[PDB]
Amino acid sequence: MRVLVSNDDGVDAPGIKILADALRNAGHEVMVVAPDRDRSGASNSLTLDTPIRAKQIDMHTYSVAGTPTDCVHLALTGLLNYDPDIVVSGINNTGNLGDDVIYSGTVSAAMEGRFLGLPAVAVSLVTLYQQAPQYETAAHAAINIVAQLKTDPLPADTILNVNVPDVTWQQMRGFKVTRLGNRHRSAPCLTQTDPRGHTIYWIGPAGPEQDAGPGTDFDAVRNTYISITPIHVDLTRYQALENVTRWTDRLT
Amino acid sequence: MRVLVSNDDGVDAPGIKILADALRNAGHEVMVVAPDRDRSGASNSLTLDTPIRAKQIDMHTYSVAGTPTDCVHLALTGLLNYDPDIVVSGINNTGNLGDDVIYSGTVSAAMEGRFLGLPAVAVSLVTLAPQYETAAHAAINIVAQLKTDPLPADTILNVNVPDVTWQQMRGFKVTRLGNRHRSAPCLTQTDPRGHTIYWIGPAEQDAGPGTDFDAVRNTYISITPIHVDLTRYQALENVTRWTDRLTAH
Amino acid sequence: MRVLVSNDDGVDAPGIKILADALRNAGHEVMVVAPDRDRSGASNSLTLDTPIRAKQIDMHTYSVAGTPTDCVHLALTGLLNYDPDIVVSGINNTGNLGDDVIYSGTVSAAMEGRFLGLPAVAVSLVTLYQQAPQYETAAHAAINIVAQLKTDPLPADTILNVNVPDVTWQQMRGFKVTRLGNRHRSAPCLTQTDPRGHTIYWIGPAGPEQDAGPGTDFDAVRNTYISITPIHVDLTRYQALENVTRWTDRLT
Amino acid sequence: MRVLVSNDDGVDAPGIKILADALRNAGHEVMVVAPDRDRSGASNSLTLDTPIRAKQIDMHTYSVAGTPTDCVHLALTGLLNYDPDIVVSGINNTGNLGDDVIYSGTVSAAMEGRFLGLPAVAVSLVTLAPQYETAAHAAINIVAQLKTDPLPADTILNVNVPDVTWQQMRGFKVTRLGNRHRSAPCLTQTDPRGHTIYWIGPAEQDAGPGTDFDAVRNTYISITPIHVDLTRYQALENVTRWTDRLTAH
């Protein structure tokens, strides 16, 4: 019904506009609070030391000079007289798979969605390489997810990290629940030289042994399956608390 | 043992130097690979699109023009002929508690430590005369304790140290992550130009008993074992049924 | 005839697209090489230490992961088999007046245009404050400037810093040649406090005595005149070389 | 005299400390207002949208969380009860020659010095053991020479120092700005992933006699008097006729 929409690529990004329109046409009351620019490369932390400017484009659309987390946080703490029951973050220009999820700005917005007691979904479009972006397919996926969460909503302890293959909806195989992978386990750092002659290092590409087998988000988007990874909102490993306590007591 | 040391505040930070010296004096073979500048404010992602420069300062001291994750990753993938069994990240100038942990650059380095199959520890000094020696003294005991009984290779330790002397610590407390910005109401002021600016509200929240907030508040060195895999495996069972019912229509 | 177009706000900016279309419809062969994101806040220097990625959107449009100067420089040094006789930089989302010109990324692209021996124009849209951007007016101004430079081109020693009032073309008074101003001469630093209690400083607003009188770019855009400031491409003050030399000899 | 000192490399930079000490020992009342971090890579514009924090380190030493222009601007508009007659910016870790001057953060601080009605000097050390003492020794002579015969209040001095000892300098040379990237052809290589990346070509250009490039090349401390007003007043005469002919149709 009521959806708060944000992203990483900025408010002028085509990914979020198509998503907002798709949700508008789906009968959902949208609410866009997005960064002023593509802040992919800056921290995702809440801006606490400095105040944040929030210019409004039009109704239901606010531009925010700050991190995606700042967007969502402000949007739910006084910036808006709006009470959404779900936060949809996206649609990101690229994909968010494996280790790229923890530091993802798109995911960080959704991460801020749960911290304030709201179900959240991070939607990304796995694009590589001439071609045309399929944000409509990713949006069409989103409008079905939000609708399915209306009937029987998933537990208030996780968010959905959704990644969409950059293709058409007919070519799309379907949906699969996947776990996060690990692309750069055996990434062998290559050493080349700049024109100046100094030594520069490249982070190695996907090695022979990489965590991208079946059941991982990498595999799903590889075989044209819209990946859905339920990820933690609490980094605390509660199943390790029992062991570390004994370890700490022997150290205390 | 062999210890790889990194941070967030940069290689010229006093937090990492005191830590490296403390580990040196503790009989551990240290190895410092740290950012060139304080990159608190930039992304923590691995730099893939551009190559990374790595200037060496001295014996086992490397300045890296890139993220803390780039430091650790390179240091274990060819930059060094060094095989450490533990990665100690710190000591950060500030603290890393609750929601500030997921986006922490200090923690991100340690996070990169486990991804390559190495136990990792993020050490921070909760400051608001920085007592880095106390945080370092805590670290040298943790790494030593991991020699006998090492961590299970599935989690890293997020350690935060109260900015005081060692004679004021009442011990260590295993805690979880808190959430101070639960329902923190934002405030609205104006700039000298009059344009409307928004402040993120100050500290209803999660900072009670068992939290790392309450830990470092009572002068206890907080130790939070955190996930290295964001995947909520205990939710995979339910989402699958939810997804199958969605696939139908 | 042949125009190279760049900006500061990124390749996905509406300012550059409308400009490119206006130049396309004007019978000019356009060529867009723009940053991948809004790099307003990063340095304008040429990226020398690291290599630059240049993804192509479509023909005549290349996205560049680097500074506006990197865009123009590469576009004229091998990235393209294209030989434009003019470099139009814009249209920037904001204005570039007075001291904001030296550090302007939009102007920096045009600045790179002259360094390689090409006439260059920086076009900006003075926007303040609900409202609708008038990029079309700024573009309509640009297509007349480029056309006028076809007949009798301005000398190859300067570039044009053009700023357009955010209004319609009919409301527009006309064009005026102006000099750069100085908004923050007597800007009195105000001192307030953050919620935490620490002391923060605000850079003072336009004081009573500010260089924005008649003949300055500020005044033109104030009275709905499209400002045109011919600015230096060589920072060297050649009229001071005669004095400093005597001063240096007395020091040598 | 009263000297306001700033830089680009940050307040913890060795370049500015040696400069400040040299000016202190020269009998000048110094005043250091420098960025908190090395902001080479960020914009030089005045921070207007957000407020600026200014932590004080010691007596006449202020760390500013903002651009070099923010440092100088604040330092002359209320942050300090200090009225210097000259602003010395440096000493930058690298050199500032030709087209690298307009976007230089070191120069931007000095540029902010003139905008508020104060003579300003940008001092850089052309490095490719950093000889900051030589660059500082050059600076203390320049500021002293400006006491007797001050600069005309319309330009600032862009000073660049060869990274050598003082016993190797053949003197000072007043030069102009060069242009090494005139027609430098870019090169095309590939990343390990195979995707096409572009390198900006190395040094037909402008670095001959009279240029600051050729100056610091022959171990001469280059002094380039640069504009503070980008307006080309000698072009105002022609553009006006060009604009009037454009206004007609």
Ligand SMILES: [Cl-]
């Ligand atoms: Cl992202």
Ligand SMILES: [Cl-]
């Ligand atoms: Cl941190």
Ligand SMILES: [Cl-]
């Ligand atoms: Cl700009």
Ligand SMILES: [Cl-]
């Ligand atoms: Cl510089």
Ligand SMILES: [Mn+2]
């Ligand atoms: Mn993004």
Ligand SMILES: [Mn+2]
């Ligand atoms: Mn830090």
Ligand SMILES: [Mn+2]
């Ligand atoms: Mn811009």
Ligand SMILES: [Mn+2]
């Ligand atoms: Mn510098």
